[PDB]
Amino acid sequence: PGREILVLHVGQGGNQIGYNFWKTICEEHNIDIRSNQRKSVEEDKVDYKSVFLVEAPDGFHPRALFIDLEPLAVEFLVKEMKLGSFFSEDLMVLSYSGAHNVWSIGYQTGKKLIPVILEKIRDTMPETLQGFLIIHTLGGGTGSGFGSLLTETLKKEFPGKGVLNFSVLPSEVNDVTLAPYNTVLSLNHLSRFSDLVVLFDNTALIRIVKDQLNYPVIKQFSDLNFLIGRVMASITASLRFPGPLNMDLMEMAHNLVALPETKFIIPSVAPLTKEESEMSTELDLVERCFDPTHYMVNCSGQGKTISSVLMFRGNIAIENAFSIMTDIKSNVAFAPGVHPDLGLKYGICESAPVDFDKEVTLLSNNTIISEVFNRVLERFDSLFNRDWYTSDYVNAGTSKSNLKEARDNFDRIIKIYKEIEG
Ligand SMILES: Nc1nc2c(ncn2[C@@H]2O[C@H](COP(=O)(O)OP(=O)(O)OP(=O)(O)O)[C@@H](O)[C@H]2O)c(=O)[nH]1
Ligand code: NA
Numbered sequence: 469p470g471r472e473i474l475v476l477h478v479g480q481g482g483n484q485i486g487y488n489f490w491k492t493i494c495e496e497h498n499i500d501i502r503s504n505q506r507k508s509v510e511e512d513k514v515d516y517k518s519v520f521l522v523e524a525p526d527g528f529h530p531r532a533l534f535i536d537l538e539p540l541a542v543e544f545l546v547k548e549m550k551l552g553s554f555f556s557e558d559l560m561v562l563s564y565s566g567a568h569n570v571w572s573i574g575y576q577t578g579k580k581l582i583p584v585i586l587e588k589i590r591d592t593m594p595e596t597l598q599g600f601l602i603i604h605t606l607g608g609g610t611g612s613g614f615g616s617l618l619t620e621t622l623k624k625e626f627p628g629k630g631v632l633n634f635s636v637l638p639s640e641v642n643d644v645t646l647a648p649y650n651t652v653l654s655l656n657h658l659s660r661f662s663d664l665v666v667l668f669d670n671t672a673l674i675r676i677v678k679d680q681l682n683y684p685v686i687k688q689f690s691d692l693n694f695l696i697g698r699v700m701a702s703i704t705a706s707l708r709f710p711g712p713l714n715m716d717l718m719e720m721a722h723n724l725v726a727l728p729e730t731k732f733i734i735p736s737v738a739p740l741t742k743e744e745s746e747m748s749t750e751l752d753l754v755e756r757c758f759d760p761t762h763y764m765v766n767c768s769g770q771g772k773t774i775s776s777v778l779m780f781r782g783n784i785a786i787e788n789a790f791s792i793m794t795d796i797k798s799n800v801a802f803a804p805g806v807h808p809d810l811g812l813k814y815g816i817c818e819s820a821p822v823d824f825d826k827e828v829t830l831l832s833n834n835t836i837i838s839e840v841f842n843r844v845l846e847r848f849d850s851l852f853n854r855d856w857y858t859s860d861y862v863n864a865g866t867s868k869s870n871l872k873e874a875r876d877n878f879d880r881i882i883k884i885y886k887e888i889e890g
């Protein structure tokens with residue numbers, strides 16, 4: 469026993485992403501998410517289901533909690549997707565009042581539910597648990613504020629376990645006017661308490677779906693969130709399936725985090741379709757991952773890579789994975805201090821994602837984060853310098869001085885990334 473992970477889904481976005489993640493995990497392990505059972509003995513593959521799944525005598529269950537301050541997002545999701553016996557009631561921590569898109573309300577109100585969450589965690593977590601994944605959006609109030617609270621709480625309550633965040637940044641035009649406040653407060657909290665923050669934003673995700681998958685229409689968030697689930701599944705694949713070169717959560721974090729503050733990560737995956745997986749080389753897929761068209765954060769260019777983790781899944785030619793490394797280092801811009809021989813961390817897993825021949829997933833610690841974060845900061849300053857929208861932060865325990873303190877720490881992180889850029 470060991471390597472187990474517990475996933476916390478927080479707020480509307482975090483729980484809706486949870487559906488796609490758990491659907492992917494069950495499919496990869498040939499588990500029927502509706503019966504809780506293996507689909508068959510004959511197609512049961514050699515694997516390690518316990519990373520994300522709890523096997524009980526009756527069947528398999530997610531090692532997850534589904535957390536929100538209002539019940540509708542989760543309840544509607546469970547009904548629509550017929551998840552009632554997988555996203556079961558004993559895994560739900562739901563209130564009634566909502567955070568009303570204010571980080572401070574999510575943080576304060578979430579405090580009331582922390583005892584229940586800790587009891588549920590301590591009720592079912594194996595002692596060998598390797599860490600926690602927190603899935604949330606940063607632009608709303610619950611994912612941002614309650615998710616920040618949970619990041620702080622778990623790091624304090626379970627020292628020695630990893631705390632990783634999968635966090636959705638606001639779109640290029642924000643669809644929550646309060647998002648700059650919520651995003652700065654969240655990123656400040658995660659800089660203090662998270663071990664690694666993997667970032668996404670909907671502008672990039674929509675671009676990928678429309679331009680790489682060519683979906684005719686996006687009618688539900690399930691036709692966006694599958695990309696986040698794919699990253700979460702693929703970067704943990706070598707914990708769950710055989711392969712030549714496996715890596716765990718903190719192994720990946722240690723290879724990425726050059727300085728303690730540089731823990732904000734941009735993910736990408738290639739290819740996006742089965743047809744492309746059958747007509748691509750390892751070199752082509754890695755080049756796609758390092759191209760801004762495939763970044764799941766909206767970026768103006770390639771930036772400068774400080775450090776990267778690449779997971780090769782499936783029908784991978786190991787000699788190609790290694791021989792292209794000089795090409796990667798020559799064709800991709802790395803930060804000035806990165807030695808020509810350094811900056812790459814490899815995992816290789818024999819299991820391809822569903823019906824694909826092969827797939828590459830990239831986690832990049834890239835100086836371009838400074839540009840992404842500077843834009844958030846500019847949005848923040850446009851509100852804060854006018855004292856707009858501050859009242860309900862102040863009324864919920866975040867003073868105007870506190871907002872400024874969070875902004876100034878956020879700026880310090882931006883400047884660290886910019887300094888590494890040269
Ligand atoms: N990618 C993605 N983004 C989402 C999803 N749901 C909401 N969002 C985005 O998340 C932000 C709003 O945050 P929500 O998750 O709705 O808010 P919340 O955490 O429930 O907080 P409150 O509603 O204020 O209590 C906006 O930027 C939305 O576009 C989702 O399922 N997937
Ligand atoms: Na909500």
Ligand code: NA
Nearest residue numbers: 480568569608
């Ligand atoms: Na909402």
